Amino acid sequence: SMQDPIADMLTRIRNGQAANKAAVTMPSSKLKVAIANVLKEEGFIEDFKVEGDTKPELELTLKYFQGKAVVESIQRVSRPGLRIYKRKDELPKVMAGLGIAVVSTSKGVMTDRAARQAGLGGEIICYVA
Amino acid sequence: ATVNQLVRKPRARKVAKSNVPALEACPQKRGVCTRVYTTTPKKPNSALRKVCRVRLTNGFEVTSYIGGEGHNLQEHSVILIRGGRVKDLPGVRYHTVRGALDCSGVKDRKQARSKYGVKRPKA
RNA sequence: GGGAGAAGGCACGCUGAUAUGUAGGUGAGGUCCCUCGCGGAUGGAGCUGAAAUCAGUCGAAGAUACCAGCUGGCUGCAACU
RNA sequence: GUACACACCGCCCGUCACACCAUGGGAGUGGGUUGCAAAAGAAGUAGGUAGCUUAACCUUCGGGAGGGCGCUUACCACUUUGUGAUUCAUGACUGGGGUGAAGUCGUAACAAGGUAACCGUAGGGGAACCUGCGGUUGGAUC
RNA sequence: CAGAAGAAGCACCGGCUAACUCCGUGCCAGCAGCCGCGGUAAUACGGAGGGUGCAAGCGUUAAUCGGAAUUACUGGGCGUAAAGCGCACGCAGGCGGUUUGUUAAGUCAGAUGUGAAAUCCCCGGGCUCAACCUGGGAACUGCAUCUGAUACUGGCAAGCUUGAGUCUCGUAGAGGGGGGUAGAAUUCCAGGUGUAGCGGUGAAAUGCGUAGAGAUCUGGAGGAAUACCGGUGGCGAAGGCGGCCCCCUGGACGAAGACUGACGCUCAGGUGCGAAAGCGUGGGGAGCAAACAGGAUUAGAUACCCUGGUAGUCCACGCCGUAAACGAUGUCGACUUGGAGGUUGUGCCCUUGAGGCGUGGCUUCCGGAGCUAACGCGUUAAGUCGACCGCCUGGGGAGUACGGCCGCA
RNA sequence: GCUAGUAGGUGGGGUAACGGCUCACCUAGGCGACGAUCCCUAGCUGGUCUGAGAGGAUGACCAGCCACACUGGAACUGAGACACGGUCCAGACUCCUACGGGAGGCAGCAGUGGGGAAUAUUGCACAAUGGGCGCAAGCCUGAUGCAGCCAUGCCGCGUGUAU
Ligand SMILES: [Cu+]
Ligand SMILES: [K+]
Ligand SMILES: [K+]
Ligand SMILES: [K+]
Ligand SMILES: [K+]
Ligand SMILES: [K+]
Ligand SMILES: [K+]
Ligand SMILES: [K+]
Ligand SMILES: [K+]
Ligand SMILES: [K+]
Ligand SMILES: [K+]
Ligand SMILES: [K+]
Ligand SMILES: [K+]
Ligand SMILES: [K+]
Ligand SMILES: [K+]
Ligand SMILES: [K+]
Ligand SMILES: [K+]
Ligand SMILES: [K+]
Ligand SMILES: [K+]
Ligand SMILES: [K+]
Ligand SMILES: [K+]
Ligand SMILES: [K+]
Ligand SMILES: [K+]
Ligand SMILES: [K+]
Ligand SMILES: [K+]
Ligand SMILES: [K+]
Ligand SMILES: [K+]
Ligand SMILES: [K+]
Ligand SMILES: [K+]
Ligand SMILES: [K+]
Ligand SMILES: [K+]
Ligand SMILES: [K+]
Ligand SMILES: [K+]
Ligand SMILES: [K+]
Ligand SMILES: [K+]
Ligand SMILES: [K+]
Ligand SMILES: [K+]
Ligand SMILES: [K+]
Ligand SMILES: [K+]
Ligand SMILES: [K+]
Ligand SMILES: [K+]
Ligand SMILES: [K+]
Ligand SMILES: [Mg+2]
Ligand SMILES: [Mg+2]
Ligand SMILES: [Mg+2]
Ligand SMILES: [Mg+2]
Ligand SMILES: [Mg+2]
Ligand SMILES: [Mg+2]
Ligand SMILES: [Mg+2]
Ligand SMILES: [Mg+2]
Ligand SMILES: [Mg+2]
Ligand SMILES: [Mg+2]
Ligand SMILES: [Mg+2]
Ligand SMILES: [Mg+2]
Ligand SMILES: [Mg+2]
Ligand SMILES: [Mg+2]
Ligand SMILES: [Mg+2]
Ligand SMILES: [Mg+2]
Ligand SMILES: [Mg+2]
Ligand SMILES: [Mg+2]
Ligand SMILES: [Mg+2]
Ligand SMILES: [Mg+2]
Ligand SMILES: [Mg+2]
Ligand SMILES: [Mg+2]
Ligand SMILES: [Mg+2]
Ligand SMILES: [Mg+2]
Ligand SMILES: [Mg+2]
Ligand SMILES: [Mg+2]
Ligand SMILES: [Mg+2]
Ligand SMILES: [Mg+2]
Ligand SMILES: [Mg+2]
Ligand SMILES: [Mg+2]
Ligand SMILES: [Mg+2]
Ligand SMILES: [Mg+2]
Ligand SMILES: [Mg+2]
Ligand SMILES: [Mg+2]
Ligand SMILES: [Mg+2]
Ligand SMILES: [Mg+2]
Ligand SMILES: [Mg+2]
Ligand SMILES: [Mg+2]
Ligand SMILES: [Mg+2]
Ligand SMILES: [Mg+2]
Ligand SMILES: [Mg+2]
Ligand SMILES: [Mg+2]
Ligand SMILES: [Mg+2]
Ligand SMILES: [Mg+2]
Ligand SMILES: [Mg+2]
Ligand SMILES: [Mg+2]
Ligand SMILES: [Mg+2]
Ligand SMILES: [Mg+2]
Ligand SMILES: [Mg+2]
Ligand SMILES: [Mg+2]
Ligand SMILES: [Mg+2]
Ligand SMILES: [Mg+2]
Ligand SMILES: [Mg+2]
Ligand SMILES: [Mg+2]
């Protein structure tokens, strides 16, 4: 059964980019929306929107630069079978700082650089490069 | 294997057995030759290789090679053996140390003398 | 199911206390009820009475006499009574 | 199609015979350790106390209290007995295995390998194997 | 003070691996970590000359980690290389859709105490240098307590409907269990006609036949299996299920709704089902046929071929628990270009039929990206991900021995 | 699968102290697939070797902790011991004996025999640091400071320089 909606979201992004889809659509959640906000702020996706009231649906508009997907790789790190938490001094660097790690901290979901600036550790949701 | 499976049963390292068990992790062992004889190698080699059946101070009875041209070993000779297999000889896992105890060096040896227990010539 | 009482071993008499006789058994008078009898309930006097534990004590020996399995190992034959 | 490549005058299977090696069973038998059920009871400590003997205290000067020795009981080391367990060594004989070497018997497999091969099972046969029943294609030809 | 005066060896030189020639020997003597070298022109054996590497040491042996991502947490695999339990149900365990509140256990931040000294590391100091000694720091990645943070995970409370399930109507189906029945055919029995062969093979022979076979007609007995339909058709968890009829009964799918409200996924151990052969007791026995017998073939022929033929195949109940039980591919869920078919539902439209436009379930072949050692897989993945389980770790010994459990064997 | 002082409770006793530590009675409990019980191996740590790391291996020297002192058992004294160079009993060995009976314990330093492939001198001094006793002086100290032997390791230097 479905047991990791976040990995499902990441996989939808990965497969849509591989299939050259303009947009990808999925059932929504607040955590998915926070992750989408980080992706949009970092410029990996173009936009996102939530439609509906009782069964909210999140749509992500993917982007391509020169005929190539902007999201070169997106990978779940913490997972239900194995949670991963890092302290502030051990936050991972993705692609020598060229990529991002999405981190859930007590101040919300942000990138690894933002968590380092705030001086917080947290749960390593995924790597994006 | 999943992490749950590894939590239940961890990865197991394979134990490696020594190729020289009669030494019992000693660099050498002393023995008494019970037999001194020759034997023929496995194919594709042909020769009369010199070996000795020797009983060690720990009670192990093994076969040891006698390297070098010519030797002075006979029954009841007291010798020192070290590790080292002879590839073409079946079940010969040890080498006799030339120049130790009753085993003499090799006569008229000029090169690699220390491997055959030969003193430096006075030249 | 057996083999098995396998094998092997420990205790055992007497006296006192626990308890002027115990647990248990039996059960009168009295009291209550009754559809009043060879009745029911309660009640326990009297009678009878193991077994155990603790302490002591005599002898060479306490299942003291009579009475009352010897045991184990390998194998042939016939299943068995 | 192929398990062939000094290339089918290829490759290759098993019994049997010979040599060596390790190992299972084996009338059993010898050691090591250990369980259980008992026996045993040095010294020590503790409890009790007939008997013997006492420097300090108390005496009404006789003794008293208290102590010690001895004796006794409890616990327990050595040691002993019976019966198990486990482990090591060893044993006439026996089972298969590996290695070597190639002697004897065949030719099972690889090509449609000359009866397609193989799996489970069952029966049979000096040996590779053969036969029945179901199954697979990891079968050539069609 | 005196005088270069007292002071250099060890391993290696075909490749890995830095360093090459001559002579001796001739599968001998010998070398060897591996690949291998030695057979009369050996850079591989032994000596010599030359050279290479280390140097008061140099080699060898033993032993640990490394290289070994070759137990893979970091950091591996399972279609065919070793590896998916034969198939399921399911306890424990692991995992858990979506919203709000609360808690602060996990998690995160800070502080405090502790984490002995020495050792390791950094900056310095002293022995002429160095080894060595030494000052200060850093580190000791941990534990405990206190104070905070609340995104994520957990607990608690309340919900929601999209996962999961219930009801209503219908559909297809060799799904299962029980009983009955039909026709074809084989064998056997009896009778009629009829006469010299039949049967079998590559050719034969065994066998059957003048005691009348084989052939043909009629009647009867009995067992087993269901031609055609029939189909890379259907159903079933797998194993498997095929004439027709009745009875009992399981699952799947579709259309509109209504209802419950995460009730879910996976599953060590456990339990159940599980082809054929085989086993036990009682029946049955036509056809077939292990074993067995005879005839052939052959060098032989314990076979292949022929003539016979017993267990068994069949039924009831019980056991066994294995198969190339295979898609050699575990279960569940999500996502990702296409084409042509099969089968089974259902909606709409028209000129009403081998009609057109859709929308579900299951299924066959091809092929794109991607993946793969390749072969190939390819929306029914071997692609891209998550949850849980099973399994592999060179070949042989060996799925064997011994021990346990199970079994009548 | 294991456990009958076994698990817990009450009361008495006992210890410097809590406690089945021990005894009497009552309850029938306690441990275990988060591996009890049994079997094999083993002193533990700071650290050491290796490794890029994660890990793997290891625990000699130095320091902390534990245990042992010929073997088995026991207590006495004492602040502290169930006591390496104390006591008692038993045992095996060695030794003395007048045959009745007695003596001993290098796993302290050095050394001997033995085993082994293999590991050193029966040295000097309490001058320094530290310890015991003593008011002190001082005495004692194989701790310690040094010396001897060994290329065992690490580090430095020389075995000549120029022509
Ligand atoms: Cu005397
Ligand atoms: K050769
Ligand atoms: K008595
Ligand atoms: K009475
Ligand atoms: K009575
Ligand atoms: K009797
Ligand atoms: K019989
Ligand atoms: K080929
Ligand atoms: K042969
Ligand atoms: K044998
Ligand atoms: K006394
Ligand atoms: K024994
Ligand atoms: K034996
Ligand atoms: K064959
Ligand atoms: K074949
Ligand atoms: K078969
Ligand atoms: K034969
Ligand atoms: K020559
Ligand atoms: K892994
Ligand atoms: K907390
Ligand atoms: K929370
Ligand atoms: K039905
Ligand atoms: K029928
Ligand atoms: K479960
Ligand atoms: K039958
Ligand atoms: K039949
Ligand atoms: K037949
Ligand atoms: K039936
Ligand atoms: K079976
Ligand atoms: K198949
Ligand atoms: K369809
Ligand atoms: K349709
Ligand atoms: K069974
Ligand atoms: K049977
Ligand atoms: K106790
Ligand atoms: K108590
Ligand atoms: K008590
Ligand atoms: K390390
Ligand atoms: K360690
Ligand atoms: K001891
Ligand atoms: K001491
Ligand atoms: K001093
Ligand atoms: Mg008997
Ligand atoms: Mg009476
Ligand atoms: Mg009589
Ligand atoms: Mg006889
Ligand atoms: Mg009889
Ligand atoms: Mg041939
Ligand atoms: Mg044996
Ligand atoms: Mg006793
Ligand atoms: Mg006594
Ligand atoms: Mg075969
Ligand atoms: Mg053949
Ligand atoms: Mg043939
Ligand atoms: Mg064949
Ligand atoms: Mg088998
Ligand atoms: Mg046959
Ligand atoms: Mg080179
Ligand atoms: Mg030459
Ligand atoms: Mg050479
Ligand atoms: Mg590794
Ligand atoms: Mg691999
Ligand atoms: Mg294969
Ligand atoms: Mg395979
Ligand atoms: Mg399967
Ligand atoms: Mg299931
Ligand atoms: Mg959740
Ligand atoms: Mg420190
Ligand atoms: Mg500091
Ligand atoms: Mg929550
Ligand atoms: Mg019949
Ligand atoms: Mg139905
Ligand atoms: Mg299971
Ligand atoms: Mg059958
Ligand atoms: Mg049979
Ligand atoms: Mg039968
Ligand atoms: Mg018949
Ligand atoms: Mg036949
Ligand atoms: Mg199997
Ligand atoms: Mg099948
Ligand atoms: Mg399989
Ligand atoms: Mg189906
Ligand atoms: Mg394809
Ligand atoms: Mg693959
Ligand atoms: Mg077996
Ligand atoms: Mg306690
Ligand atoms: Mg030890
Ligand atoms: Mg590594
Ligand atoms: Mg130590
Ligand atoms: Mg000693
Ligand atoms: Mg005292
Ligand atoms: Mg002590
Ligand atoms: Mg002392
Ligand atoms: Mg001493
Ligand atoms: Mg000494
Ligand atoms: Mg010696």
CATH of the domain at A78: 3.30.1490.10
Nearest chain A CA: its distance from B7 CA (Å): 12
Q: Residue A117 sits in which domain range?
A: 74-128
How many residues are recorded in chain B?
Answer: 123
d(CA A77, CA A100): 12
d(CA B26, CA B83): 9
Domain count, chain A: 2
CATH of the domain at A31: 3.30.1370.30
> Could you tell me the distance, in angstroms and rounded to a whole number, from the CA of residue B110 to the centre of ligand 77?
94
- Which amino acid is located at B23 in the chain? L
**Domain identity same for A78 and A42:** no
Q: Which letter, b or e, does each residue of B16-32 get, where b requires 16 or more Cβ atoms within 10 Å of its Cβ?
A: eeeebebbeeeeebbbe
State whether residue B5 sits within 8 Å of chain A by CB.
no
**Domain identity same for A22 and A60:** yes
CATH of domain B1-123: 2.40.50.140
Of the residues A29, A50, A69, which one is the last residue of a structural domain? Answer: A69
d(CA A29, CA A24): 15
**Domain identity same for A63 and A102:** no
Query: CA nearest B81: which of B105, B114, B57, B48?
Result: B57
A17 CB below 7 A from strand E atoms: no
Phi-psi map region of A41: left, alpha, beta (phi>0 left; psi -120 to 50 alpha): alpha
Q: Residue B82 burial (CB < 10 Å; 0-12/13-18/19+)?
A: middle
Task: Report strand pairing: A23-27 vs A57-62.
Answer: antiparallel
Q: Which residues touch strand D (CB under 7 A)?
A: B 42-43, 90
3-state SS class at B93: coil
Phi, psi of A127 (to 5 degrees): -105, 140
Looking at residue A69, what DSSP letter applies? B
Looking at residue A21, what DSSP letter applies? -
Place of tokens 């690699």: B112
Phi, psi of A108 (to 5 degrees): 110, 180
**Domain identity same for A43 and A62:** yes
CA atoms lying within 13 Å on the CB side of residue B50: 12
By the 8 A CB rule, do A105 and A122 touch?
yes
Chain A positions touching B2 (Cβ under 8 A) are 81
In chain A, what are the helix, strand and coil shares in percent, each to the nearest 5? 30, 35, 35
**Domain identity same for A82 and A34:** no
How many residues are recorded in chain A?
Answer: 129
Q: Residue A54 burial (CB < 10 Å; 0-12/13-18/19+)?
A: exposed
- Here the tokens at position A119 are 């001086």
Alpha helices (runs of H) in chain A, residue ranges in sequence order: 5-18, 30-42, 112-118
**Domain identity same for A28 and A64:** yes
- Here the tokens at position A109 are 């979901």
Query: CA nearest B93: which of B81, B103, B84?
Result: B84
- Which amino acid is located at A47 in the chain? D
C-alpha distance from residue A40 to each of A23, A37, A68, B61 (Å): 13, 5, 18, 78
- Here the tokens at position B34 are 């019970």
Neighbours of B73 (CB within 10 A): 20
Q: Closest nucleotide to B6's CA, by C1' atom?
A: E73
User: Helices A30-42 and A5-18: crossing angle, nearest 10°?
Assistant: 40
d(CA B110, CA B71): 16
d(CA A5, CA A29): 9
Looking at the DSSP assignment, which residues form a beta bridge with residue A93?
A: none
Looking at residue A1, what DSSP letter applies? -
State whether residue A81 sits within 8 Å of chain B by CB.
yes
Phi-psi map region of A114: left, alpha, beta (phi>0 left; psi -120 to 50 alpha): alpha
- Which amino acid is located at B62 in the chain? V
d(CA A18, CA A21): 8
C-alpha distance from residue A112 to each of A46, A83, A87, A88 (Å): 21, 17, 11, 9
